[PDB]
Design an enzyme around this catalytic site. Structure first.
Site, PDB file in Angstrom:
ATOM      1  N   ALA A 171       9.461  -8.660 -20.914  1.00  0.00           N
ATOM      2  CA  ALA A 171       9.449  -7.521 -21.822  1.00  0.00           C
ATOM      3  C   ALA A 171       9.457  -6.211 -21.052  1.00  0.00           C
ATOM      4  O   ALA A 171      10.207  -5.286 -21.389  1.00  0.00           O
ATOM      5  CB  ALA A 171       8.227  -7.593 -22.736  1.00  0.00           C
ATOM      6  N   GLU A 201      -2.909  17.120 -19.769  1.00  0.00           N
ATOM      7  CA  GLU A 201      -3.241  17.661 -21.085  1.00  0.00           C
ATOM      8  C   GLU A 201      -3.299  16.549 -22.123  1.00  0.00           C
ATOM      9  O   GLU A 201      -4.132  16.579 -23.036  1.00  0.00           O
ATOM     10  CB  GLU A 201      -2.216  18.717 -21.492  1.00  0.00           C
ATOM     11  CG  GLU A 201      -1.914  19.754 -20.412  1.00  0.00           C
ATOM     12  CD  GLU A 201      -1.356  21.066 -20.948  1.00  0.00           C
ATOM     13  OE1 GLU A 201      -1.370  21.287 -22.178  1.00  0.00           O
ATOM     14  OE2 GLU A 201      -0.892  21.885 -20.127  1.00  0.00           O
TER      15      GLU A 201
END
Ligand code: TA1
Ligand code: GTP
Ligand code: GDP
Ligand code: MG
EC number: 3.6.5.-
Lengths: 88, 433, 451
Positions: C12, C254
């Site tokens: 995956a 952030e």
């Protein structure tokens, strides 16, 4: 010298203001027993009054002693001292 | 010769600074290359307030740009006036504060403050007579708030007898772009209230209201907000650079405006402001400017003056006008709105007049109010602050940078004390006991 | 130099990596061979953005990616595919068997003798970087390699680097559909590692992506390629703040500062608003308000959970294209007045906003329409607890009888480990149930001198 004199005078003026504010509400309550909110005593306008916040305010006692030289040459000194003692 | 050093930190500070250097470099005729191509002879008379002279009859501003992220600097260099600035003044690092006040103040900014102070000291030592400093920054951010407060503290330690202005953009109720605005704003106000002579209050909602309702811009952008800000910063210091009938230095404004040391938060405003098509329908006179200055919708701080009382106000007019009109208008404003002015100051309106207006206008005016309504601003932040501090919402990001929980309590107590004086002078009598 | 190192573990992870690198090469003008004609035609530029690609002297651009897997097949597919000459030939693939849907086999038995090579190449890539920001690890829960080897690699990375952010994109097992009988054991085993060693884990569910493809893109028969392309779009929107200019840039720090209240709660959901077919791209405005509203709808979530059953703790919006701040402010104000969307009382602000000028690109042979505006939303909420709870039930229904347990103990594990992992998961759910509870009350009072 000028910087030292200016800072000393600022601190003394703020101390005079905080002392005068503290005495007035005092007398007031002691007689009016009312609680005119808590007014607002400018403690933060100087480090000197800020560190002595707990001693100046609250349940406390205070007394300022002033010395006045006795000559005729130090007149300009002596009168000024009385003018500072006239506060409070 | 009065001379002022300009500092700009963070994204907001850098953008406003760039726009400001374009407005001041179009009143003092300066080519983007740096040469002079003006017309009037009074443009060069006082050029040394903002500019140093370079050998090829060029002019370089005293700006000092600071940021913990390099990218903003690039956006300044690749711009209309990027080449005007000196390369050595672009002090910056990497690994920005990330909207963390602690990183800006303690961890990251502490490494770069030495370089910034070196540049500032070099710029100041060449000045003939330093008048003061200016700083443009944002309270709700990272590198901006922390580095600005740190630099303010260091500079006041080194230069105690000089003015320190500050054009700060603070948080707002509805337009909020960061989730940790309250902590940064609180810890910044804890520093500004102690180490600053004048602070100007700006917030984006008031500027958006001005753009939408007065200028009638359909799609305002940050450029227009910085335009209005730059207009007021140019208006404040007009009398250092030009002659007039009645001058007003920065120190005169400081002396007349602040009654006590801790009340130096001001509400700025500018007049006139019209929306293109309406220009022909309004006659430009001193009464019109006075009417627009005192209107609550024109303020730049989102604090309604009608909820408080003006401790002081200052009006700096620019243009050829009659002093009688100015005096009568200010007296009438005081007399009619007697409820909105404090009673123990006999006359609380400073007035100054400068002869030369802006380029494309005949008259202009700048307004600086000092009113108790500003308390509301701080109170709002305080509410949000406690709403996050009772649970320690994001506190580990701050304590992981060497902070302690007591500092937050100090900042909150200091802001609450500051609100006290304002709330006090705010009533409209004190008789009962 | 906002550099990031991408990691792809398992089948995956590798396929999502193929989709991601196809998108990245298309964005930067890099041809599958490894060269960029744009600089040759123009004469020079910054199009060789250092975030992903390292530029050699000859003008080739090598990606800052590291592929790992225990099956040679998945990577012999790319070693002989279109992008054979893009990647460095050292692909770190153990010529042996596979973990066989066994956490123990991937972690203890066969995970060794490859991990040293992976860490050596990670060290080499890191030394080439200046101002490295973090790691982006792609893997899948439930698989042997993607769980066990990812846990081992994350542990070693946390030991070695420490302060660098490690963002995780992973495939959670779905509620109903599954591709293996022993998914819950592996997932509950790797949760104990992803809780401690990661900084922010983004979870996606294949049933949700299938529903989005069926409803919005009108694809009745989707494959893994479409899901990988959507995940690539999400990762590109996350990373675009540090590659192109914008009005408000949002770095990777952030992210963690604004979306993680407490260290044990870093499991946000992710959504992409303008998922729409080319035919339906018309008859629609695709304004900022529309996409912002579409982000909040339960039907468009990429994990099968209902946000209405929980509370929003933090939200981060990343806009791309022709977006101006005032529309974002208007959309946020409009959302804040809706009663179906509940925010925790201890987060009055709620929202982080970022804006980027670069619009999204279109992959040839893709299914997403060309659009002028887009927004990617990342939302830390409490509804994610439900996604764990179902899994726990399944785990219990297998562990009461010790089914499929001898395979795990035969590869070096003991029974008690399972119990420990389960207990850890329980604690995590409890933390969620404790963080969304309202504040006690006013909790303190003052009197205005009642005398
Ligand atoms: C035909 C005419 O009258 O032009 C005016 C004009 O139309 C108006 C609308 C101008 C115009 O202002 C705007 O439209 C505007 C838009 C967004 C934000 C701010 C302003 C003007 O742009 C603003 C411009 O101002 C100047 O020229 C001053 O020198 C000004 N400098 C700049 O704006 C400037 C900006 C970037 C680069 C260089 C200069 C200034 C103002 C205050 C202090 C210092 C300088 C002027 C007179 C006008 C235009 C051009 C339309 C007005 O603005 C100002 C600040 O004067 C709007 O309110 C006034 C009223 C004016 O009538
Ligand atoms: N979204 C998405 N999920 C995938 C993809 N390929 C596999 N999966 C998921 O991965 C799960 C199986 O685990 P794998 O990732 O294949 O584990 P592995 O890489 O094969 O490692 P081993 O089990 O040791 O062979 C399945 O349940 C799938 O749902 C893909 O291309 N896209
Ligand atoms: N006026 C203006 N305000 C801005 C601009 N950019 C950001 N802001 C404001 O500043 C806040 C973000 O702070 P930021 O600039 O990132 O601080 P920094 O990281 O230290 O530079 C937001 O709440 C915005 O309201 C701008 O270009 N102009
Ligand atoms: Mg496999």
């Amino acid at each position: 010298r000028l910087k030292e004199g200016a800072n000393i005078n600022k601190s003394l003026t703020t101390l005079g203001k905080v002392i005068s504010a503290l005495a007035e509400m005092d007398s007031g309550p002691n007689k009016n027993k009312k609680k005119k909110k808590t007014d607002f005593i400018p403690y933060r306008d100087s480090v000197l009054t800020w560190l002595l916040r707990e001693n100046l305010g609250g349940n406390s006692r205070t007394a300022m002693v002033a010395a006045l030289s006795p000559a005729d040459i130090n007149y300009d000194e002596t009168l000024s001292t009385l003018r500072y003692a006239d506060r409070a | 010769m009065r001379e002022i050093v300009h500092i700009q930190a963070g994204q907001c500070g850098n953008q406003i600074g760039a726009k400001f250097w374009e407005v001041i470099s179009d009143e003092h005729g300066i080519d983007p290359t740096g040469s002079y191509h003006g017309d009037s002879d009074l443009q060069l008379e006082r050029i040394n307030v903002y500019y140093n002279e370079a050998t090829g009859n060029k002019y370089v501003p005293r700006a000092i740009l600071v940021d913990l992220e390099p990218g903003t600097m690039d956006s300044v260099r690749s711009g209309p006036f990027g080449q005007i600035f000196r390369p050595d003044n672009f002090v910056f690092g990497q690994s920005g504060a990330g909207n963390n006040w602690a990183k800006g103040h303690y961890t990251e900014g502490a490494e770069l403050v030495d370089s910034v102070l070196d540049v500032v000291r070099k710029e100041s030592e060449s000045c003939d007579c330093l008048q003061g400093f200016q700083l443009t920054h944002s309270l709700g951010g990272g590198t901006g708030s922390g580095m600005g407060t740190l630099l303010i503290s260091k500079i006041r330690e080194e230069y105690p007898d000089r003015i320190m202005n500050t054009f700060s953009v603070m948080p707002s109720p509805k337009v909020s772009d960061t989730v940790v605005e309250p902590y940064n704003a609180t810890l910044s106000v804890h520093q500004l209230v102690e180490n600053t002579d004048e602070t100007y209050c700006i917030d984006n909602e008031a500027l958006y209201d001005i753009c939408f309702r007065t200028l009638k811009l359909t799609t305002p952008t940050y450029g227009d907000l910085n335009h209005l800000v730059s207009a007021t910063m140019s208006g404040v210091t007009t009398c250092l650079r030009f002659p007039g009938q009645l001058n007003a230095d920065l120190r005169k404004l400081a002396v007349n405006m602040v009654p006590f040391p801790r009340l130096h938060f001001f509400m700025p405003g500018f007049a006139p402001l019209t929306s293109r098509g309406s220009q022909q329908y309004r006659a430009l006179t001193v009464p019109e400017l006075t009417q627009q200055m005192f209107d609550s919708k024109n303020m730049m701080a989102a604090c309604d003056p009608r909820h408080g009382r003006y401790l002081t106000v200052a009006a700096i007019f620019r243009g050829r006008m009659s002093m009688k009109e100015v005096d009568e208008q200010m007296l009438n404003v005081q007399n009619k709105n007697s409820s909105y002015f404090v009673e123990w100051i006999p006359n609380n309106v400073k007035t100054a007049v400068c002869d030369i207006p802006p380029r494309g206008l005949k008259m202009s005016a700048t307004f600086i109010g000092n009113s108790t309504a500003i308390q509301e601003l701080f109170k709002r932040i305080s509410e949000q602050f406690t709403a996050m501090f009772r649970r320690k919402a994001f506190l580990h990001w701050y304590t992981g940078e060497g902070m302690d929980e007591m500092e937050f309590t100090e900042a909150e107590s200091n802001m609450n004390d500051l609100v006290s004086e304002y709330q006090q002078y705010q009533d409209a009598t004190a008789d009962e006991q | 130099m906002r550099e990031c190192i991408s990691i792809h573990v398992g089948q995956a992870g590798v396929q999502i990596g193929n989709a991601c690198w196809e998108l990245y090469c298309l964005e930067h003008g890099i041809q599958p061979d490894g060269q960029m004609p744009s600089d040759k035609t123009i004469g020079g530029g910054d199009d060789s953005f250092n975030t992903f690609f390292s530029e050699t002297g000859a003008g080739k651009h090598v990606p800052r990616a590291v592929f790992v897997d225990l099956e040679p097949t998945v990577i012999d597919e790319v070693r002989t595919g279109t992008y054979r000459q893009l990647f460095h030939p050292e692909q770190l693939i153990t010529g042996k068997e596979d973990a066989a849907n066994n956490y123990a086999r991937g972690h203890y038995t066969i995970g060794k003798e490859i991990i040293d090579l992976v860490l050596d190449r990670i060290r080499k890539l890191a030394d080439q970087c200046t101002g490295l920001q973090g790691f982006l690890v792609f893997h899948s829960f439930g698989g042997g390699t993607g769980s066990g080897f990812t846990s081992l690699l994350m542990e070693r990375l946390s030991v070695d680097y420490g302060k660098k952010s490690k963002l995780e994109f992973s495939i959670y097992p779905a509620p109903q559909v599954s591709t293996a009988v022993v998914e819950p054991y592996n997932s509950i085993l790797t949760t104990h590692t992803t809780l401690e060693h990661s900084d922010c884990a983004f979870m996606v569910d294949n049933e949700a992506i299938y529903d989005i493809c069926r409803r919005n893109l009108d694809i009745e028969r989707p494959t893994y390629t479409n899901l990988n392309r959507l995940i690539s779009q999400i990762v590109s929107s996350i990373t675009a703040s540090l590659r192109f200019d914008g009005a408000l840039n949002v770095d990777l720090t952030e992210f963690q500062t604004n979306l993680v209240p407490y260290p044990r709660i870093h499991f946000p959901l992710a959504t992409y608003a303008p998922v729409i077919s080319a035919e339906k791209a018309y008859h629609e405005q695709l304004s900022v308000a529309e996409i912002t509203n579409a982000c909040f709808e339960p039907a468009n979530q990429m994990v099968k959970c209902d946000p209405r059953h929980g509370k929003y703790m933090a939200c981060c919006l990343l806009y791309r294209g022709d977006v101006v701040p005032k529309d974002v402010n208007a959309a946020i104000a409009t959302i804040k007045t809706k009663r179906s969307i509940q925010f925790v009382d201890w987060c009055p602000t709620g929202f982080k906003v970022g804006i980027n000028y670069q619009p999204p690109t279109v992959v040839p042979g893709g299914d997403l329409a060309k659009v002028q505006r887009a927004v990617c939303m990342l939302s830390n909420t409490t509804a994610i607890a439900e996604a764990w709870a179902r899994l726990d039930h399944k785990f219990d229904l297998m562990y009461a009888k010790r089914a499929f347990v001898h395979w795990y103990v035969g590869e070096g594990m003991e029974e008690g480990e399972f119990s420990e992992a389960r207990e850890d998961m329980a604690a995590l759910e409890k933390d969620y149930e404790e963080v969304g509870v309202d504040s006690v009350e006013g909790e303190g009072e003052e009197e205005g001198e009642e005398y």
